[PDB]
Design a protein around this ligand. Sequence first.
Ligand SMILES: *[C@@H]1O[C@H](CO[C@@H]2O[C@@H](C)[C@@H](O)[C@@H](O)[C@@H]2O)[C@@H](O[C@@H]2O[C@H](CO)[C@@H](O[C@@H]3O[C@H](CO)[C@@H](O)[C@H](O)[C@@H]3O)[C@H](O)[C@H]2NC(C)=O)[C@H](O)[C@H]1NC(C)=O
Ligand SMILES: *[C@@H]1O[C@H](CO)[C@@H](O[C@@H]2O[C@H](CO)[C@@H](O)[C@H](O)[C@H]2NC(C)=O)[C@H](O)[C@H]1NC(C)=O
Ligand SMILES: *[C@@H]1O[C@H](CO[C@@H]2O[C@@H](C)[C@@H](O)[C@@H](O)[C@@H]2O)[C@@H](O)[C@H](O)[C@H]1NC(C)=O
Ligand SMILES: CC(C)[C@H](N)C(=O)O
Ligand SMILES: [Ca+2]
Ligand SMILES: [Cl-]
Ligand SMILES: [Zn+2]
Length: 611
Amino acid sequence: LDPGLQPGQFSADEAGAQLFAQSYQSSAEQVLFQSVAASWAHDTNITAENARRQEEAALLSQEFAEAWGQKAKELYEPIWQQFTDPQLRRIIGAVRTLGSANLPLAKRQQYNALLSQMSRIYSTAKVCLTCWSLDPDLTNILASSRSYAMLLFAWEGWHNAAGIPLKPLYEDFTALSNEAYKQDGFTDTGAYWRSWYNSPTFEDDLEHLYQQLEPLYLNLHAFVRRALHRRYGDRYINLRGPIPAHLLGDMWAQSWENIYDMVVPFPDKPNLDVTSTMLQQGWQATHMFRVAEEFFTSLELSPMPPEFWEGSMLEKPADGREVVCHASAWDFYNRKDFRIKQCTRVTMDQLSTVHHEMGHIQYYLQYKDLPVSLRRGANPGFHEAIGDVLALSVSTPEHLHKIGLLDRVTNDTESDINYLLKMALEKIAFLPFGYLVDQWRWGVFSGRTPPSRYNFDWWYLRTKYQGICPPVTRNETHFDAGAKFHVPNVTPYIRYFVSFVLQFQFHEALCKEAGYEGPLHQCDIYRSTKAGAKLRKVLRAGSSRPWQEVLKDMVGLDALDAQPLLKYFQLVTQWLQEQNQQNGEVLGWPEYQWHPPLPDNYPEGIDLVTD
Ligand SMILES: *[C@@H]1O[C@H](CO[C@@H]2O[C@@H](C)[C@@H](O)[C@@H](O)[C@@H]2O)[C@@H](O[C@@H]2O[C@H](CO)[C@@H](O[C@@H]3O[C@H](CO)[C@@H](O)[C@H](O)[C@@H]3O)[C@H](O)[C@H]2NC(C)=O)[C@H](O)[C@H]1NC(C)=O
Ligand SMILES: *[C@@H]1O[C@H](CO)[C@@H](O[C@@H]2O[C@H](CO)[C@@H](O)[C@H](O)[C@H]2NC(C)=O)[C@H](O)[C@H]1NC(C)=O
Ligand SMILES: *[C@@H]1O[C@H](CO[C@@H]2O[C@@H](C)[C@@H](O)[C@@H](O)[C@@H]2O)[C@@H](O)[C@H](O)[C@H]1NC(C)=O
Ligand SMILES: CC(C)[C@H](N)C(=O)O
Ligand SMILES: [Ca+2]
Ligand SMILES: [Cl-]
Ligand SMILES: [Zn+2]
């Protein structure tokens, strides 16, 4: 470690710890910057050389964390918890958490290599018929094909190509990650991930939320399954069974807005998918980002700085090198550089993604002058929620009309049901997936799910929560969890479940603060400077204060609460219940063992339905 980056001498008291923290920050910004820069250079240009450079940068970061972590313990271990400044307590608590820096050098190098190789495998996997990439090709097929066989080929091809080679690396990764966090006092890595929520009752509280939400999912599931039955027939859809996992608009069946045009309740009403209008009007990635930015500035939040526009990767490179296309938002920790890396396509769901990623950037801009250790969301769910809150306003037919994307305007009960159904496809269908992914990982990290049950337990959870089944047979050579970005890229998932609840709590509070008095699902906070100021208060706090108190200030309650989500959806929750009863549906999938058969001459003759 460079001399300038090494911890010096500080007194073993609170006053010294304050000086230690100031000195830590100064060097940490440099070390984080070089690491983030190196990761950027890799993710925007995946090469063995750029992986090597990123790995070298990670080792420097691990040296840094060890030096400053060991100094924090040497000086402050018996006393930091009784310090009177609560921000300082959080800074010291973060600095003394070493993570992968607890591993000796040889294991740090193994750990860092595993992360690179897992990232490379996921983001360069292809399905050959002429080979399809996940983004744009397989993504577009899953969203827009209504050919059972084409969808199947894409689903099976992707899961086999991405998942199979990840399995050995993922086992090795899990062991090293646990070894690392055990030395910070956690029984496994999952316990460390959960500790960010500072709640002894986290798992129970999530489970109690899920119980309130599940009836909404069950009704939405049955209604969609009926539509799929009438399209694909009794051979491929069991009205009392799980839905084939490839038919719901998305590679992971994680949200279903892409099959809205197959299930729309009232097809005589305005077309709420504005993608074709975006395309007719000549929208491009940059316009999508500029429109998102202008929503933020309407709330008196910050525009994107010149560094964002000059440095970001807003379209898939045509040159046409390998990249991590999975949308992400980047803080370089120098208070100047902030970037989005997205292979942006011109669709309505992508416009929401742009808002999602820009919400991350807005958080970074607002807390950039906090101590480095407090430049995080109040919890990780807060970070995920911000952009989604704005996107809820943007999605309203009234807002879409304001920005020239929805010509017809209407306020009748059928149009409301259509809108709420579209939003339920996007939000309610996600809830089980958002909840199950880290249930799977937590069991893997605890040892409850060994490698010999990776896939058995994944599909157990996939069926249990989502009521879906694989549309081809799977066995333990397959590693289908690995075919989802966040698994090989080691990004926790429970944040997204937390976010999908929290965002309705936020939306309700900002709508109230805007002085809006109509139905919650027709609120638009656009141009509300008061809404803006209430949200800014949250963003500026970073992780300086307990999330329960930040939430209480914002919404009047100190806990996650499903009621705002239930209130938003009430009309379609009722309508779906009625529809399913009239149709005599069974709610759930009591034929839990059911899987669809293969199509007749699959996969030969896929050439007849491709190009
Ligand atoms: C779409 O239409 C609905 C319904 O409008 C109502 O019913 C129609 C048939 C007409 O008779 C309307 O004149 C009538 O309001 C609108 O929702 C309704 O908005 C009003 C006005 O904000 C709401 O009234 C408020 O409710 C709050 C909460 O209790 C009170 O504190 C306020 O003082 C005020 O009474 C009303 O509750 C709400 N109705 C329902 C059923 O939710 C909606 O605004 C409109 N949307 C658009 C985009 O035009
Ligand atoms: C993608 O990364 C590679 C490194 O793997 C970059 O290759 C370097 O390119 C510069 C500029 O032309 C050359 O002067 C170097 O000699 C190259 N280095 C190596 C190690 O081969 C490449 O430029 C990157 N591409 C982009 C668009 O950034
Ligand atoms: C696991 O499955 C592998 C490939 O899948 C199989 O091939 C398709 C075409 C169908 O026959 C399907 O029913 C099968 O699952 C097999 O090559 C392999 O033998 C299986 N692995 C183990 C360890 O048994
Ligand atoms: C929240 C969810 C949509 C997440 N961004 C994902 O792509 O998996
Ligand atoms: Ca989608
Ligand atoms: Cl998380
Ligand atoms: Zn996010």
